[PDB]
Design a protein around this ligand. Structure first.
Ligand SMILES: CNC(=O)CCC(=O)N[C@@H](Cc1ccccc1)[C@H](O)CN(CC1CC1)S(=O)(=O)c1cccc(OC)c1
Lengths: 99, 99
């Protein structure tokens, strides 16, 4: 799709069999989801945003379907204000900015 | 132009007499610039993201040029680690997400 920006670019994602709403976030390097359970190994990590740093759990090689497009990559889980899809997965689904 | 997301979507912007590098950020409702002593009236504001909140100064109707496209609107100024062009200005320069 072409998505305009007068509204938040919120899309439905499917991950671990569950449907969630998430924000397409070109200002995010990484994909960060609110507290949830995911299967398999994870590693502690820290990431920075506008207000400082948080601790997250890094899950590698996780499939997510983002607005009908498949990605498999790194998903960070922690106290983000909202589920965000970052550039690591935006690139996988062929997302560009255009003006 | 079309901007891929392999790297951060940083572009040159102009505000006041200063050229700066700024992120084209679909995940940002607002435009948030690094500390700078702009003229005019402002109002205090708090904005929140990963890590928590920062205190900013809200300046209204500030002209900004983003990649040679003219925009004018609200700019938040404060101790952000990166200059952020948010949706309030991205719409003005005709920016969309496409995949
Ligand atoms: C590994 N770190 C990252 O991927 C950064 C994630 C991130 O927080 N991105 C943000 C931009 C940023 C901030 C600080 C440094 C670098 C980029 C993000 O794209 C925009 N952020 C909101 C997203 C939910 C997090 S935000 O910067 O916090 C923001 C901007 C404008 C208005 C806001 O609230 C009204 C909030």
């Amino acid at each position: 799709p072409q998505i305009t920006l007068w509204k938040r670019p919120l899309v439905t994602i499917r991950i671990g069999g569950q449907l969630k709403e998430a924000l397409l976030d070109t200002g995010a390097d990484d994909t960060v989801l609110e507290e949830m359970n995911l299967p398999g190994k994870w590693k502690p990590k820290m990431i920075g945003g506008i207000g400082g740093f948080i601790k997250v759990r890094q899950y590698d090689q996780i499939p997510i379907e983002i607005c009908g497009h498949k990605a498999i990559g790194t998903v960070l889980v922690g106290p983000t204000p909202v589920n965000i899809i970052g550039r690591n997965l935006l690139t996988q689904i062929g997302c560009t900015l255009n003006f």
